[PDB]
Amino acid sequence: SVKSEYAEAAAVGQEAVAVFNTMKAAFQNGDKEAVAQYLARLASLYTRHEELLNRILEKARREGNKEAVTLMNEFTATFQTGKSIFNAMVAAFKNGDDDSFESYLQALEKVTAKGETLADQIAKAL
Numbered sequence: 668s669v670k671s672e673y674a675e676a677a678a679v680g681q682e683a684v685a686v687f688n689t690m691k692a693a694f695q696n697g698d699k700e701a702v703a704q705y706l707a708r709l710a711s712l713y714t715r716h717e718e719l720l721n722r723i724l725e726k727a728r729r730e731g732n733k734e735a736v737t738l739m740n741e742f743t744a745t746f747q748t749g750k751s752i753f754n755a756m757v758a759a760f761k762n763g764d765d766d767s768f769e770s771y772l773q774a775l776e777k778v779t780a781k782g783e784t785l786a787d788q789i790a791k792a793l
């Protein structure tokens with residue numbers, strides 16, 4: 668169902684959270700080669716998450732689950748903030764700008780939290 672598909676999306680989102688936290692520790696320890704690999708893996712994981720979230724939203728729309736559509740619309744907006752800041756972080760890494768990377772990483776932790784509160788309601792709504 669859409670509900671089991673959202674559980675699959677949630678796990679993928681949580682796989683990115685785990686990798687992100689591993690990457691943060693690598694950045695702090697100054698392991699740049701590891702960071703580069705983790706950033707590539709994260710991009711793949713976010714692209715997958717986005718794909719799954721869009722299909723779920725489109726399905727909720729076709730099913731007429733108005734409360735779920737409202738919540739998912741809010742979450743897709745938050746997801747795009749994540750995307751914009753993530754891309755900025757990757758650019759900061761490419762440019763050798765550790766100050767911006769630090770800033771963007773702290774910002775993404777805020778986005779993740781505000782997304783998590785929204786994701787928990789979506790699950791209950793589908």
Ligand SMILES: N#CCc1c[nH]c2ccc(Cl)cc12
Nearest residue numbers: 710713714717746749750753
């Ligand atoms: N939280 C977070 C990061 C993120 C959200 N949406 C994304 C879409 C694409 C890429 Cl590469 C990254 C992201």
